[PDB]
Amino acid sequence: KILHRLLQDS
Amino acid sequence: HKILHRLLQD
Amino acid sequence: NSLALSLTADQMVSALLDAEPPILYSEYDPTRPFSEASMMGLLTNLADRELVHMINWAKRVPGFVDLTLHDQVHLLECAWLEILMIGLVWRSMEHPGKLLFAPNLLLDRNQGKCVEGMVEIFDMLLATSSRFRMMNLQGEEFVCLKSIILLNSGVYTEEKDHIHRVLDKITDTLIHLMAKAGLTLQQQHQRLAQLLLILSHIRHMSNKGMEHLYSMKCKNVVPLSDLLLEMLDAHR
Amino acid sequence: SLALSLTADQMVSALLDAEPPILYSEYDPTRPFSEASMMGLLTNLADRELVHMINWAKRVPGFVDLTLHDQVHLLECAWLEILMIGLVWRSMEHPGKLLFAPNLLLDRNQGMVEIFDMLLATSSRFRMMNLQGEEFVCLKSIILLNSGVYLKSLEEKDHIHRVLDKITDTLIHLMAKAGLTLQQQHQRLAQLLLILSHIRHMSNKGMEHLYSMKCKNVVPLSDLLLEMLDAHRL
Ligand SMILES: CC1CCC(=C(c2ccc(O)cc2)c2ccc(O)cc2)CC1
Ligand SMILES: CC1CCC(=C(c2ccc(O)cc2)c2ccc(O)cc2)CC1
User: Fold this and answer.
1) Is the Cβ–Cβ distance between D81 and D200 less than 8 Å?
2) B3: closest CA of chain C, how far (Å)
3) Contact: C73, B4; criterion CB under 8 Å
4) How remote is the CA of residue C164 from the centroid of ligand 1, in Å?
5) Distance CA D194, CA C200 (A)
6) What letter would DSSP give residue C28?
7) Would you give the DSSP letter of residue C108?
8) Which CATH class is domain C1-236?
9) Which residue on chain D is closest to C148 by alpha carbon?
10) D67 C-beta neighbours (distance < 10 Å), count
11) 3-state secondary structure at position C35
């Protein structure tokens, strides 16, 4: 999912 | 008219 | 001017304690409900009788009488499911993993599993219940919170100052109870915060419950009473 | 955790610095708008706000300390609440209006309207209370952590409760420095937290409304908004 991805990016 | 109207008067 | 604001803290507490509705019983047939029909049937009948007590309870809440009849209606229409649920959660405190809708009607999450969208709301109610339990919520605190819900939930929709001041009075009453219990100033405002944050979850559970009730109304499964229909349609 | 070691003033400074920007909409006065077109603007605006909110949440003390799945859950639960309290905060100095964007000021006009009136009332409440920016960022951070707090352990809830207690202390600290008496502090604290109940209500009502226009196939909902909305589907 998108939310889990954006939260994961760094 | 509402039942609530009545019950609040009694 | 209102009598509510001239009351002392103990007077406020005593007034709220005296206004408390009774814990009602469900139908005395055993059969732990599992079907949606038997489940909602018992809950509808129970809530219906509770609503009559809630209405007469609200009249005995300081400051509530001073409002116009229409404002009283609005606040009751807005908060009724919140009030029922915080009662349910309070009753269920010392029965972990269970919901005490009535002394002769204890439900667990396993009975919510047989109705669509119910077990989610059940889990939320159970979590709120254990939360109250871990905080050691006192009856005197509970009645303050229930009055707060009544006066606050529909207070945004020149006498608005009245409810605002009454709400402040109940805040003072809460603090008074915590100071009476021997809590420090830091413990007091931390506990006050914790209690009031739970009111956001109670609100959330009410709105989710309202959806759930609207669904079963559309199902035409359980006969709703005219009173419950009017309280429900108020949210429509 | 760095959050639990922060002072009240550092907590405020941290939250202030983490503040997302105020975004613009695509509103054009010369362009006609239907009920659908207006929702399109709000949808597009909210979608771009979400990306900023996610990165804002990472800078909220204590939030990163949680597992990814718990970070996801809290955002899924609170996103509309956080958007709305931002909207209400922006609309304080505009009585009877909602400032969705600096180029998009809407009043009680476009039918929906019930939620508008609720948002307007909340803004009226913020104005009458003279809500401060420091109090606002505390409230918004409380919403993020609180709205979805209620396996095995999942002693995360304890951590969240700890941070929540920290933000409570910060609020009281702010009110104390503002010169308020002990009674005024407790009263204002209660006033602020009861607003979160109305914010929760408006979010739930809004989520139902957003679900309606989704099934109506009227407004192009973004991929992320479809996810956030579906999380509330019960
Ligand atoms: C998922 C459940 C949770 C609680 C619930 C209630 C309810 C809440 C508290 C009570 O003491 C009694 C009843 C209900 C059920 C049917 C009805 O017609 C009115 C209220 C709503 C649905
Ligand atoms: C009538 C209600 C509907 C919901 C709402 C929205 C909203 C509208 C459409 C969406 O797809 C997502 C969100 C909102 C809130 C705050 C903000 O900064 C931007 C948009 C505000 C007003």
Assistant:
1) yes
2) 6
3) yes
4) 29
5) 8
6) S
7) E
8) mainly alpha
9) D194
10) 10
11) coil
Q: What is the 3-state secondary structure (H, E, C) of C55-81?
A: HHHHCCCCCCCCCCHHHHHHHHHHHHH
Q: Measured between alpha carbons, how far is D149 from D73 in angstroms, rounded to an integer?
A: 9
Q: Which helix (H) or strand (E) holds D134?
A: helix D133-146
Say which CATH topology domain D1-234 has: Retinoid X Receptor (1.10.565)
Give yes or no for a contact between D92 and D37, defined as CB atoms under 8 angstroms apart.
no
Q: Quote the crossing angle between the two packed helices C139-152 and C160-180, to the nearest 10°.
A: 170
Amino acid identity, position C70: H
Ligand 2 atom showing the smallest separation from residue D101 Cα: 18
Calpha distance C68→C63 (Å, rounded): 11
- Among C27, C43, C222, name the best residue to mutate to test ligand 1's pocket (greatest count of ligand atoms within 8 A of Cβ): C43
Question: In this structure, are residues C196 and D193 in contact, taking their beta carbons and an 8 Å threshold?
Answer: yes
Q: Is C100 helix (H, G, I), strand (E, B) or coil?
A: strand
Chain D residues with CB under 8 Å of a chain A CB are: 51, 54-55, 57-58, 68-69, 71-72, 75-76, 223-224, 227-228
DSSP string of C143-188? Answer: HHHHHHHHHHTT-----HHHHHHHHHHHHHHHHHHHHHTT--HHHH
Pocket test for ligand 2, best of D38, D42, D115, D203 (most atoms within 8 A of CB): D42
Contact between D166 and D3 under an 8 Å Cβ cutoff? The reply is yes
Q: Return the domain boundaries, chain C.
A: 1-236
Q: Is the Cβ–Cβ distance between D172 and D185 less than 8 Å?
A: yes
| Residue whose structure tokens are 């939250």 | D15
State the Cα angle at C137 between C136 and C138, rounded to 5°.
Answer: 110
Residues paired with D106 in a beta bridge: D98
- As a whole number of angstroms, the longest Cα–Cα distance in chain D is 57
C interface test, pick of D138, D197, D198, D205 with most C CB neighbours within 10 Å: D197
Q: Give the pair of three-digit tokens for residue C60.
A: 């005995």
Method of elucidation: X-ray
Q: Which chain C residues contact residue B3 at CB under 8 A?
A: 226-227, 230
> Contact, D4 vs D163, CB < 8 A?
yes
Resolution (A): 2.2
Distance from the alpha carbon of residue D43 to the mean position of ligand 2, in angstroms: 6
- Residues of chain B in contact with residue C65, where contact means CB-CB under 8 angstroms, are none
Residue-wise DSSP of C185-236: HHHHHHHHHHHHHHHHHHHHHHHHHHHHHHHHHHHT-S---HHHHHHHHTT-
Q: Do C158 and C99 form a contact (C-beta atoms < 8 A)?
A: no
Residues with CB under 6 A from ligand 2: D 39, 42-43, 45-46, 49, 83-84, 86-87, 100, 112, 115-116, 206, 209-210, 221, 225
Local structure of residue D202 (DSSP, 8 states): H
